[PDB]
Amino acid sequence: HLYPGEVCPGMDIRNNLTRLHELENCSVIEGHLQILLMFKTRPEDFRDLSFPKLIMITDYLLLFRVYGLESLKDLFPNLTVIRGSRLFFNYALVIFEMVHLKELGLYNLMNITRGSVRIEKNNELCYLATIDWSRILDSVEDNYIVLNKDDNEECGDICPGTAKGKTNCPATVQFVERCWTHSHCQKVCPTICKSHGCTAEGLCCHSECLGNCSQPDDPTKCVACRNFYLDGRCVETCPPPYYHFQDWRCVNFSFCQDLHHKCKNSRRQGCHQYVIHNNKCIPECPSGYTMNSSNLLCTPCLGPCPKVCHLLEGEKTIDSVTSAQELRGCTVINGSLIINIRGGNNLAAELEANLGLIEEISGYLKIRRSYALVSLSFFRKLRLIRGETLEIGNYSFYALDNQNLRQLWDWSKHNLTITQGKLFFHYNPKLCLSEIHKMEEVSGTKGRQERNDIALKTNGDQASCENELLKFSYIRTSFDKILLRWEPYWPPDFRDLLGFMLFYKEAPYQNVTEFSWTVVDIDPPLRNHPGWLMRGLKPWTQYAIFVKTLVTFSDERRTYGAKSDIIYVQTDATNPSVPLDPISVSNSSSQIILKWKPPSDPNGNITHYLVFWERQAEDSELFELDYCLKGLKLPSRTDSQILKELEESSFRKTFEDYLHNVVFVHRPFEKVVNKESLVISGLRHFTGYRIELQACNQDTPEERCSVAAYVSARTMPEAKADDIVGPVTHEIFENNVVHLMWQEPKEPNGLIVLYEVSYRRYGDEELHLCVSRKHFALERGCRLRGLSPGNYSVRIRATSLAGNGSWTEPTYFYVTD
Amino acid sequence: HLYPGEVCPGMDIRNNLTRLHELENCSVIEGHLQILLMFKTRPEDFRDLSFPKLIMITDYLLLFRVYGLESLKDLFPNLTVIRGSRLFFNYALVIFEMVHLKELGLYNLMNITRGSVRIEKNNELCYLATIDWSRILDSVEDNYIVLNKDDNEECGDICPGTAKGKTNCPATVQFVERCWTHSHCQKVCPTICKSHGCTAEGLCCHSECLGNCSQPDDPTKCVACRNFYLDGRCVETCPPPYYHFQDWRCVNFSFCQDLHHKCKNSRRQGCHQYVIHNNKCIPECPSGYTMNSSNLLCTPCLGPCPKVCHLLEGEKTIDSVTSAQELRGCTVINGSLIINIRGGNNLAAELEANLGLIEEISGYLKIRRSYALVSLSFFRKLRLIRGETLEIGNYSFYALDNQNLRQLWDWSKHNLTITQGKLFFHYNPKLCLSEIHKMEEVSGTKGRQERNDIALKTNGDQASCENELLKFSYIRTSFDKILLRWEPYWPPDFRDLLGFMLFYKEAPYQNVTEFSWTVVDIDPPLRNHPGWLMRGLKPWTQYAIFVKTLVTFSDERRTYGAKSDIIYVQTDATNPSVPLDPISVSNSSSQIILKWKPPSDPNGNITHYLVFWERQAEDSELFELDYCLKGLKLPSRTDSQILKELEESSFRKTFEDYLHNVVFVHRPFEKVVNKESLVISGLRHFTGYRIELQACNQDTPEERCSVAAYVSARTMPEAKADDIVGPVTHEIFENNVVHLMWQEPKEPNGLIVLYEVSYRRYGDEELHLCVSRKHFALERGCRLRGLSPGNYSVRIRATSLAGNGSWTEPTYFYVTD
């Protein structure tokens, strides 16, 4: 009971109202309701149309360009709740371009479980601002209501009550009215119940009811079930032996089994092979599980487990990787496959990932005009071709007009078989007959092929199918060049040899398979080991080299020629480049940190670095030239943007190039090992130092390595070393000739630039005086003259390259009056 | 005189000082002086080295990593001016990474004509901040002086004068000294002369001297010539019969002629074929001119005129378009050409532009492993191959291992000949023997080719060389589909036919040459005109279709098969899409402008538009429902961003798709022709209008076209139409029953929502009152009661949907007391 009708799967009404009355009985839609493209329909047609039994909708509702529809108050008078199991572009209710629509009329919808509402292009619709979307939908932030008649202030939304003081329903927030139509207005239950709903008297329903109820506190009287529906009784969870189905109703095993039976054979278009798992009738077994036909339980399959991908009409054409995406993970293909890859990028890897798990093809495989393919290696696991379905002429393998196809599979490792039909190969220039004969002997189709089945004049013609072997004889290397030699091969008829080809490329690893190369041709020898010499190689790199002959195509038995094996050759090393960014920082009196970067061109492995730091004496003129005479200086020793960027970069690159073809051949030094930083200790304070830096790779056997990079730094001085020590003695010979004998700061910051002497009469002003190095040396101190007799005090300060010093303690001294 | 030595071309000193003394005599360098990579050099080596005669340098000066060089005061003691004719990376003086360098010493350089100075990485160089670059170089804004010993305050730059009051040279701007070394300091001439210079006494030189002079006002005593040098006499312009040479000196015809004689044969590396033009010995004739061997004048050559491009060692390999750029504009190639184009983009057009002007190849042409080439059409003007140089085997044309080569040239239009040697073709799958035989008959090489010269088994095998013709029999079109038929062709042996191929592509123009396509295969008929039906076409487009047979390669005489001619087929038209963005704007009482855009899918040519505008009556409830009762409303009728953008775009695209496969079949209207805008006239003021808009393409023969797009608008009202007209009459029946008989605004803005009446006692307050439509209709005016007797005035205002009106004139009226 609880539903007079059945459940109707969602449909797509279009272009005729005769399909709309299919809902004459059913009350719940376990699909989506879409009504669109209704042009000839007139408003008089909707006057006598209603679906009062429709209550529950699972997925969503869509309306688009339905002429003659004025309001839904009659179409869906009892639509209670939209479950929103599957959303339409993240929308559970879409109303788009609904001309002639005046008002919604959905006054019986209270709950929308998922999604938002998108109403747009409704130039006639009114009654939108009078809707409490907060009470209807839990999360209203995803709404979209624009370009309507209520966008501009034009809708006179009037709902019952105003003639009697605005009764029959309340307002909410500014306090604004909420109403659905001109006759029916929105109903809001008390907040004391979240979503169970309330009756007319306001009494709340049972916790299991959703939206509406008939008798308060009765799970058997709900109209909608919050969790699951069961024989007219809402329940939180379906007890055994019932399984939750479609997220809203509970079913027995028999129904799911019958649906699966329908889906096997008698359900072609998009049926779901329902299997029971985790007490849920899921449409399909999830990842890492398999379906067992006995009872349809998603048992965890061990390892790769079958995923049969039945093809539509038994034929699929793979043009690009996107078409292969739909086939991803399919191990067995129940049909025939066609490959027509004309172009793309980085193929044979994504294709291998998507299709490598294929293990069987029921029908036939056909490779046709696949220009970008180079090999069929991407069919990693392909083992057997059933070939139950055969093309015209009873063909199982069809290869045609492949330009770059060079091999099918490695037949020293791979196994394959074909049951029915015969092979076919035409217009495959780069595929020799050797693989075709491997197919006749391996696939067991030797007795099946007949005349004209395999083209003997268009397949093995332009291909490279050398069978003999070539051995390198003399190999020597160098820092730049490489000389190569091999045994002189001659075909049975010497006139049929055109020359050799040499291939080489950068080989960082050893995973080179020859499937991007530099080709160099070599003339035949004059009937003397033929060879070639390289010239443009980069030092200390591994190279992959192999030589292939080139023989003309005589009409007689093919002289297949010889191609050597792939070998790896490593170039020698040379002296590295200059280390980059040498920066020196002083943080102590004798500790200077040094930072740098590895050279841009190591040209080998950098075994050790080399740092030379030498003490630099101070400048000569700082000694014999005065710095306090009139006129001096304190020796305080401490697209245009893109175009200019390219110009500067090219200038720097030009100088780097100049540094790269130079053609190479008692100071305290330390060899840094595997470290890019170095500190120094035991240095004189505040002294200029010249730092020469080198990078090196070879140490013991006649060591030779890079050229030097220079940088300089000065250590931090000592604030104490410049202080004056010793009593300041005074002596006058005849007439106030003040001689000042006092010790010099024999440990200064570099040197003593000048002295300053200041003296002051008691209660009088102090007068200062300079003392130069030359004057101090010649006088062995300072000489003062023209001073009035009395008692004075002397303040002496010393200056160095660091800066001004500290005045000594004022030793007051009295000259006779 | 004026120069004891000759002029030395600029060189590149490197790795040994033995090349430096080559300047023992010459005094002017008409080149560039670069000294770099001097490692083993010691400072003692520079002690006894000087070049006092060097005065004038034309291009620039470069120093880089010259160990042992302390200062240039001895190297270049008389370098007066650097002309800077050709700059090094926009720098006329580069000093980079000069270790051991202390000071510049260039105290005799005054003028730098062009470029700036770049001094960088000089951790020892000082005397930089004491340089007046403004006086030296005219434009100093391009200087670059960083990362030196003067960047940090570490150089005590001291220059003579301080011991004697800073004399012997002045300062300039803060006022700062300018000096070159510790012994020689910069000399600045008085501003009264711009650049002619001054002597020791300050007297200015002649206007033609540059930098320095010996006797003031003497053009014959200058050291450098401002404009041009001539036999020790500076001159503004060289008079005839002398021509300006190298921008600084004048020469006779004999010298330029001898230089050209040296250049033609006995000058291999980079000589300039000097020709006299416009009184200048230019290195080469400019664009649009030619060289005549009689007198070497750049006469204007008529039309394409020869530009012979002699090749280095007679062999050039073209790998990419960049390699072809160097050959651009060359009409005759004196050498041999090799083509090895392996890849690229949009080839055969840029290559044709760069190389299409070639008219002759002296040596041989060789196309080898050119995988990306499709035809030799880019050799537009190639006519004759001289073939004086032949490879091994005496070959002139060498084509080898070309995968996509399909034709050489069209031999109904092109002409070609080859003098010496024989042809060669091997491993050209897509080139049939027909063109090779065309070559044997056209080039005149039929008698030269011998056995094994042309491969008969590896050229015309995989190619498409159909010779017969196919004629279409039945062709009919549709709006979407196309059905095609042709005459049933059968080869001589019916078993050798595999099927037909059909090609079609979008064909906007008719310049289709079949050289991007969609291929569809067709099975042979059952021995009944074979044909195909199309399904995925876009309406109203022109299609290029041609059918090519596919016949197996029998061992007997080739059944070449038949390919039809390229034909152009145009699909039918259908009803267009909806017009985009319909916007309506009101700017008058009856004028409303309308704007829109053409439909996105015209599906033909839009002959005319269709606009339907209908008057909409006002809402019904506005009449019978009061709007002034207690409780009312004034009817004031007026990466997540990327993901959401893609979601919205896909939603719109889904609805457009829904609109695209609909499968199609008395109002005042007007057909707009070839106009996207429309205005309307003669409309009631402030009335709702519904506008239905359509696009159309077919008019007379059973017209049918797009579906409607809707939009609505309202006209602007009249501020006068709402005014009240007519006297306001009053009458009291028994007891102050004030009846107000006055005319209604029978022409309102939509309708009269309500009236308001206000009356006031003399010197007292005014009280207002509403009047509803129903009350006004039933009372035929207003009724007033409960009013004290006396003299009053009435103010009446009318309201409409536009808004509040204007109160009428207060007509004071007296009721009996």
Swiss-Prot record, chains A, B:
PTM sites of type Phosphotyrosine: 371
Effect of substituting residue 93 to Q: In LEPRCH; inhibits receptor processing
Record note on what altering residue 611 to F does: In LEPRCH; impairs post-translational processing
Effect on the protein upon substituting residue 379 to V: In IRAN type A
All ranges on the Extracellular side of the membrane: 1-665, 666-817
Effect of residue 808 to M: In LEPRCH; impaired receptor processing; impairs post-translational processing
Site, Insulin-binding: residue positions: 39
Annotated consequence of substituting residue 31 to R: In LEPRCH; Helmond; inhibits processing and transport
Listed result of changing residue 198 to R: In a gastric adenocarcinoma sample; somatic mutation
Name listed for the protein in its UniProt record: Insulin receptor subunit alpha
Outcome reported for the amino acid change (mutating residue 713 to V): In RMS; decreases post-translational processing
Organism whose genome encodes this protein: Homo sapiens (Human)
Residues modified to Phosphoserine: 370, 377
